């Protein structure tokens, strides 16, 4: 724990990949993280590849 | 044209998706663009989904 | 040109500069672009300098 | 904890603040983290505030 995920959002999606946004809160500060999720044949996310996190 | 792609780079790759970086130069300014490329069964990129561009 | 400007907004203004926000839509996805406008003595904007674009 | 700090670097320093850079490696990918360190009267850093992390 320690850091808390407050919100997630699907920004763009494909058969195989999805661009994810998360709002993180750690030690009283708010961050916006953009990630790429990797989907298998069943449409599930098998790997998250964080791309960028920024203070907001 | 007008804007010039100066450099591209593979930051992370998967069977299906790749995280791309490009250095763009437009009107004398330099930008770093992060994108997600969508790959087909043959490993080729069929769609680029820009995620973020920032002045550097 | 593929991308469509859907909204602009004046976020902050100064004697010399103004912070502009735009919502861009390209290939069905929405982006938030922040720019800085340069104002002359006559109160007009003489140059717009894009700072960052991000998928929203 | 999955992610490994591989390099830190002092990019700029001031009476009160110091700009820190770190290279993080997680799941085989490398990230560049920029933080701000807060210095007290005794020249020591009292708080580190992460500003941005990006895949490189």
Residue numbers in the entry:
A (entry chain A), B (entry chain A), C (entry chain B), D (entry chain B): -1 to 54
Question: What does the paper behind this entry write?
Answer:
Here, using functional metagenomic selection, we describe AcrIIA22, an unconventional Acr found in hypervariable genomic regions of clostridial bacteria and their prophages from human gut microbiomes. AcrIIA22 encodes a 54 amino acid protein that impairs SpyCas9 activity. Instead, guided by an X-ray crystal structure of AcrIIA22, coupled with mutational and biochemical analyses, we show that AcrIIA22 encodes a DNA nickase. By nicking a supercoiled plasmid substrate and relieving its torsional stress, AcrIIA22 renders the target less susceptible to SpyCas9 activity.
Anticipating that structural homology might provide better insight into its mechanism of inhibition, we solved AcrIIA22’s structure using X-ray crystallography. The asymmetric unit in AcrIIA22’s crystal comprises 2 monomers stacked end to end, with each monomer folding into a 4-stranded β-sheet. A DALI structure–structure search revealed that the AcrIIA22 monomer is similar to members of the newly recognized PC4-like structural fold. Despite crystallizing as a homodimer, AcrIIA22 migrated from a size exclusion chromatography (SEC) column at an elution volume corresponding to a calculated mass approximately 4 times larger than its expected monomeric molecular weight. Indeed, AcrIIA22 was predicted to form a stable tetramer when analyzed with PISA, a tool for inferring macromolecular assembles from crystal structures. This putative tetramer has a molecular mass consistent with that observed by SEC and comprises pairs of outward-facing, concave β-sheets. A series of hydrophobic interactions likely stabilize this configuration of β-sheets instead of the typical α-helical interactions seen in other PC4-like proteins, potentially explaining the absence of an α-helix in AcrIIA22. Consistent with this possibility, AcrIIA22’s β-sheets orient along each outward face of the putative tetramer, resemble those in PC4-like proteins, and form a groove that could potentially accommodate a nucleic acid substrate. Our tetramer model predicts that an interface at the C-terminus of AcrIIA22 is required for adjacent β-sheets to bind one another and form a grooved, oligomeric structure. Instead, we speculate that D14 may contribute to AcrIIA22’s nicking activity, as 2 D14 residues from different AcrIIA22 monomers sit very near to one another in our proposed tetramer, such that they may be stabilized via the presence of a divalent cation under physiological conditions.
